[PDB]
Design a protein around this ligand. Structure first.
Ligand code: A1IEH
Ligand code: A1IEH
Ligand code: A1IEH
Lengths: 56, 282, 250, 236, 282, 236, 56, 282, 56, 59
């Protein structure tokens, strides 16, 4: 039961991982996630504002 | 099912720049109103002509997982193999992350945290100076014991409490690789809290601040049976490395120097450094 | 026009004829506790309308030399209507808030205020390594004064304005939910704060959920007028409040 | 085969799970037998009732008195029968009960609790009692009017000689510390006369009550820790 | 058959709480009768109005497997590399789990047990104090030998019995990881018995108690060939870690302090601590 | 199974990723709860505005003055309002801003920046301002005629009280050092009177402006490094 | 001959195991079993009693 | 997907030799014109009769990957465990590849480079000579810390800065294998530059040469807690091994001996050695 | 997820590789590439010249 | 898992090929650019002409 995934590298490559312990806390760091969303802190307003239109 | 083949996360590159030409219209992207508490979303393409550029930069290294995914010293202490004072032959440290400044400041940028922990121990020994040093001693061995809150606490190096039957412990011998373990999320709440603006008693009395929620236990270390003809001093360093991290409610980084290990007390500090005048640029 | 806003909670209404948008916490609207997230067993009580209404919390006077003020919640509303009674009679509580801060002046006045809600605004004592009672930081609905100079009395909190009594740069408070009241183009600020905490519920007498701060970044100024000060008023309204753990009154 | 040793090699962790060689290869173990009473989880033990020594009056010449709660025929209209703190792992009352012993091996606990009271008076005696649980607060109740505000049950004594008060799990956190403090208080439990005890002629003027403690089906514990009740100074 | 894929055990969460409303009926869940020896199964939903709550808590950490699955010291002893007394240069320990208090109390909560054993040895050395200590000695080596009942027993460090041909043994050198082995279930009966209310002879005479069933053998340790010009003392600690455990017939935990290693003897103890009066709650 | 250890065995690297045994087997973690305001990348913080203390006049008795840029009714036709170097991680102006703090934890940075200016004068006051960004060069601008050659925007004060100057990313290298030097300079930013400020009778003769700094959506950082602003001499 | 199974983790993950020794006593602890039944000690009566109904 | 089976690279052998016979024609392969800057492509088959030969030689060992794929010392330094001078108890080295001559010359054959780095550390210790040497000391431990540009710098062995919370570090103990790590491509530009014909300031003033682009940071090393009664000296050697290399714009190898670590300064040197006369061949 | 490829040896042989780390910089040296082209430095002229034909 | 170390363990060979941990996890490298004049084998250099100093007359 092995997992194969790509590894970080511009535009110019696989590694295998296996878990040996029965506790999920023993796994290695999952530092491959890159999803993000800044609208929570930058646009917390109630009514959406179009950049082109005047603010008020 | 010999291979799972985890799908690619798909490198998320930053936004590109689109070509823009001369404009003359009633739209005014530049003008806005910060009174709304909304940060403007303008881009350089909206105020001057720009060429088309493909950006291959990525924000991989700025993730909270990577930002906090570095081991850092959190405590160091010394204990002697043999000495007159009983309290000086072993260490007793209440667990807390506020002792060392750098790691404290790093953590304090978020109000709440939830992560697994990876602990590593570095142990070194040295012979104390003295008039007579000629001796022969085999390799030393050390014991690390973790005592959850409310458990028995040893009072001397050779106490009965060192016979751990439920308390996890590690026996380590010098010359090998540093010891290591993994610790899951062990908070009674749903997340660790770096700050706590409240009291202990229901009548707004007693302890105040984050000291109230610190009940992680203790760590004890001793030489197993080493008792040299001459004193030998050892030092232990503890390193913490969060894993699988999640963070909430960011807060501004601290500015004033730390002064207490269990309080936010500080002294007023200037906002920043000064210069000759508002126009000086040299 | 989008410069006019109207808010109706319970049996009270707020109308502002000149205002900006309404900031909404971290993009989360207040809501009741879900079944799969609760921990207490017994049935909660949900006295909407009786408790979800606007409560004006006294008034301050803005002078040319003002430095700022702060209030701490929910203790500020400790003795305000049925909300106070419910908070007294219950072990656990949970509620979001809607904060509305009014301040109006003529076209010939100038000034700027920062309105910000700081969750878990822990504060340090005036003298390092010295404890203080629960009276130099919250005493009901009365507002507390910041100080331009460094505090010296050992029985009260460090009031140095530029550090915000938190050891952080005052200019960086923008990270928290906030709004600006600029007398040129604004008269009020509205903030909707969801319930933020590390546990589903908590006692409201022992824990200060969040702190409200008003700081004049540009000091008030005027010339040749009969008005000597600009009053400031604060109004709050709990939303989706529910209590639990009925006990004898504290 | 190239390899590199990571930190933690050659360390001895007392709570690890690794395979190791067998010192008695091809050993034939004795066949298994299904002995009655298999236990597969300490909670099964934790849910069994046990007597609570509520009568800790600092003057108990006879130890067995600790299990008997006195009751009298003539008492003021409203009077307190007993009161105690709800600290199952720390309070002296629950410290050594069958439930308390299990918790002392752990650091965190959560869930509801059951308190069962049995009236061991005469068959002709009768009475009513009010038992109330007060969540955490600034001050414990002092009079029945204060107690009756919180969770409570009115107990009537008749053919059924036992009544159960279920203490609900009301807390701001998912878990509570066994070594409880001001932050994680749990409240108080008190019992008061509702009507009083009445007896006919030719019966004893005093009676006794006993209390049983156990955990509900949602109870649980976490973080194993070494108990502090047992200690030694020299090898046996 | 490159992967078996063991089916999930299906996390068993604790029971949820169902919403309940006002009630007025002849059913009386609260009233019961403990005289039957039956513990009531009421829930908070049966006595007060409750909301619907989904519990994700699990009782994983309370299983007997995890409760007893921690290594604990069971014996420690000292022996010298060179000395005048022959009996002082090696150890001879009859195997038993009653020596150390914590592990004993943990085990004694069940009448019968059946498990595999994992044994780990921690060995440390130190140079004895003296007037002259300047010496050079290579790394030391130790031998651990297990002697089932009835086998020959050595009488001195250099006895012929140390040439084990059937008795399992371990040779270990300082500076490496601690030694370890696995031991299967080696009881003549169907399960280990912590208690035995009976005698040895058929006429109700002789040894009494659990001492009768203790026939697990002995353990012997010695320095292989180390014989220093000056004395060197070593200490050995033995750790037991049950595996694949099954338990039967739980019994109340002990209350009085232990006083003998092969008996249940004790001294009467108060039930618990005292307080001012029955109403004191402060 | 034959094996050979490669160099690097038994070393402790503080930034490694290896599996290790768990010290608390089969521990039950508390259920997760979705607290509002989750943050998944420091850039999300970096894009929030923060006030810039531009008025560092070496004579600020009152600290809060550092946030106010003076403006006067009567000034020469062309006059400079302020000037500063564009060193977000090194210059004293941007050193302690919400953006500057994040960069100081890294060594390389790239992308565009936003400077927002808000006029906090009276409602009857009016004026125009010229804000220009000058790429690196041998000499910074000295007069408006020099400044207007580079990138700039003419700001008109009206109902909209805020204007945004987007500093484009013009550089010979894909990245720039946080500890900037002559080689990796970034240029200058200056503001000048375009028309001047005019006020009617009965208004204050002076006003103030504030500046906000934030990063665009193409900003990024690299090479984590320990910040130099915080230090200690003895264990707390 | 490898076994793949899930590892402990609320509601937000596989590890591989292989046995190297010929004696079952050498295997690692099987601490993944969570089945339990308390009725043995809590309801040892002969006649089942309904909670709603009176005890006697 | 248990096996990918990477396709063969197909050994690229050198060109073969084709049989050629007598010729008499107007084609003149031998005659050319170097003025065009074009190197002639003639082969021995074009000027004399040749047999058919199959060449199995390959140019595998001449690839840039293999040419630079060898670890080489780049720096060595000494530090004492205990001494009066604080600056003498630890090392502080600004990273650069110009210190050691051989590796410098190897790299300087290409103008631009782009590669990953593999770093290995070799540490050795020795007891300083003195009148009294009889002492006993346990194994020593060392710490290596990497400080990116702009980070805090320690000023003494026991400074607070040694509590790395973000700076990567390695703790190593003597007697084990040498420490090692991998470093990715960390240049702000698109490739490392060995040469830079330019200035720092925009007015053609200030620092000149490749010293301007060197901003890789520092490395610090110290004994963790060793403090012997008598001095002990340690030496550290740093080895660099490029990986995944790409090179551009080759340049002629250097001829004059190096004289400065941050400059191209040199002294004029003869083109080559001499001989008796143009005809001497002995 | 294992890779199988040939290993260097005249005309007279497989090895397996697996990647254990999540960063491509940790992989081993890829010294199996032998493609090359010298025309860049030897024939940089604009008009191709035939060896047989005269240079000018 | 039983194992035995063969000779050569813990040695440092300067021409070995082994995987090692990365000290800067999830580092984002700068995008590649095709600079003119890439060289992939020293022979390419070796085939370029160069002037030979034949007149070594010791004078
Ligand atoms: C109030 N919180 C306490 C936790 N603190 C973070 C934290 C959490 C856990 C730890 N260590 C947990 C731990 C890990 C391993 C052990 F062996 C041990 F005893 C304890 C250290 C710091 C943030 C503030
Ligand atoms: C009367 N029983 C005896 C067993 N005791 C538990 C017990 C069982 C076996 C052991 N050790 C077995 C063992 C394991 C490994 C050895 F090398 C060896 F010699 C013996 C220790 C404690 C419970 C009470
Ligand atoms: C001007 N360039 C600088 C780089 N130099 C090549 C070079 C690049 C990087 C390094 N070392 C990078 C490094 C690798 C590992 C570390 F721990 C560390 F701190 C730094 C050494 C030489 C060529 C000339």
């Amino acid at each position: 039961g092995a997992q194969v995934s790509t590894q970080k590298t511009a535009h110019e490559i696989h590694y295998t991982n296996i878990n040996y312990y029965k506790d999920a806390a023993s796994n290695s760091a999952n530092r491959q996630d890159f999803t993000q969303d800044p609208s929570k802190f930058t646009e917390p307003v109630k009514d959406v504002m179009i950049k082109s239109l005047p603010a008020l | 099912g010999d291979v799972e083949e985890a799908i690619e996360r798909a490198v998320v590159h930053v936004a590109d720049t689109m070509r823009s030409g001369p404009s003359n219209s009633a739209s005014v992207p530049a003008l806005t109103a910060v009174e709304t508490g909304h940060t403007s979303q303008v881009t350089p393409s909206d105020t001057m002509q720009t060429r088309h550029v493909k950006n291959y930069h990525s924000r991989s290294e700025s993730t909270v997982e990577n930002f906090l995914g570095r081991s850092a010293c959190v405590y160091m202490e010394e204990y002697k193999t043999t000495d007159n004072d009983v309290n000086k032959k072993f260490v007793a440290w209440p667990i807390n992350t506020k002792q060392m400044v750098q790691m404290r400041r790093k953590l304090e940028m978020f109000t709440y945290l939830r992560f697994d922990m990876e602990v590593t121990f570095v142990i070194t020994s040295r012979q104390d100076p003295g008039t007579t040093l000629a001796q022969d001693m085999p390799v030393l061995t050390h014991q690390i014991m973790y005592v959850p809150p409310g458990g028995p606490i040893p009072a001397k190096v050779d106490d009965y409490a060192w016979q751990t039957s439920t308390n996890p412990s590690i026996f380590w011998t010098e010359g090998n690789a540093p010891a290591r373990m993994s610790i899951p999320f062990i908070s009674i709440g749903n997340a660790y809290s770096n700050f706590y603006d409240g009291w202990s008693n229901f009548d707004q009395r007693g302890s105040y601040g984050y000291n109230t929620l610190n009940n992680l236990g203790h760590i004890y270390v001793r030489h197993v049976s080493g008792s040299s003809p001459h004193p030998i001093t050892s030092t232990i360093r503890v390193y913490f490395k969060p894993k699988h991290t999640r963070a909430w409610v960011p807060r501004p980084p601290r500015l004033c120097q730390y002064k207490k290990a269990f309080s936010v007390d500080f002294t007023p500090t200037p906002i920043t450094d000064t210069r000759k005048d508002i126009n000086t640029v040299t | 026009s989008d410069r006019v806003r109207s808010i109706t909670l319970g049996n009270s209404t707020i109308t502002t004829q000149e205002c900006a948008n309404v900031v909404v916490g971290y993009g989360r609207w207040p809501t009741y506790l879900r079944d799969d997230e609760a921990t207490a067993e017994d049935q909660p009580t949900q006295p909407d309308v009786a408790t979800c209404r606007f409560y004006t919390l006294d008034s301050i006077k803005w002078e040319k030399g003002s430095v700022g003020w702060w209030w701490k919640f929910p203790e500020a509303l400790s003795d305000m209507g049925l909300f106070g009674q419910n908070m007294q009679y219950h072990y656990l509580g949970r509620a979001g808030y809607t904060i509305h801060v009014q301040c109006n002046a003529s076209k010939f006045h100038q000034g700027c205020l920062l309105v910000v809600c700081v969750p878990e605004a822990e504060m340090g004592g005036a003298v390092v390594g010295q404890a203080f009672s629960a009276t130099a930081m919250a005493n009901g609905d009365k507002a507390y004064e910041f100080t331009s100079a460094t505090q010296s009395d050992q029985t009260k909190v460090q009031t140095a304005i530029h550090n915000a009594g938190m050891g952080v740069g005052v200019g960086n408070l923008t990270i928290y939910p906030h709004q600006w009241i600029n007398l040129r183009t604004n008269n009020s600020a509205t903030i909707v704060m969801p319930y933020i905490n590390s546990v589903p519920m908590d006692n409201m007498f022992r824990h200060y959920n969040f702190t409200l701060m008003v700081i004049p970044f540009v000091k008030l100024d005027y010339a040749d007028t009969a008005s000597t000060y600009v009053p400031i008023t604060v109004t709050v309204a709990p939303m989706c409040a529910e209590y639990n753990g009925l006990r004898l009154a504290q | 085969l190239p390899t590199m040793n990571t930190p933690g090699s050659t360390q001895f962790l007392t709570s690890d799970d690794f395979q190791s060689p067998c010192a008695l290869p091809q050993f034939d173990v004795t066949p298994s037998m299904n002995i009655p009473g298999e236990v597969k989880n300490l909670m099964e033990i934790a849910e069994v009732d046990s007597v609570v020594p509520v009568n800790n009056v600092q003057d108990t010449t006879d130890q067995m008195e600790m299990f008997r709660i006195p009751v009298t025929i003539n008492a003021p209209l409203q009077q307190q029968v007993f009161g105690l703190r709800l600290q199952p792992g720390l309070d002296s009352v629950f410290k050594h009960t069958l439930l308390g012993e299990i918790l002392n091996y752990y650091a965190h606990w959560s869930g509801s609790m059951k308190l069962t009271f049995v009236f061991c008076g005469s068959a002709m005696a009768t009475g009513k009692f009010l038992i109330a649980y007060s969540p955490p607060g600034a001050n414990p109740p002092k009079t029945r009017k204060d107690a009756m505000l919180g969770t409570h049950i009115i107990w009537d004594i008749g053919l059924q000689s036992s009544c159960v008060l279920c203490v609900p799990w009301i807390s701001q956190t998912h878990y509570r510390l066994v070594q409880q403090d001001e932050y994680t208080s749990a409240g108080y439990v008190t019992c008061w006369y509702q009507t009083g005890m009445i007896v006919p002629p030719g019966t004893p003027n005093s009676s006794s009550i006993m209390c049983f403690a156990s955990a509900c089906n949602d109870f649980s514990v976490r973080m194993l820790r070494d108990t502090p009740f047992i200690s030694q100074d020299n090898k046996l």
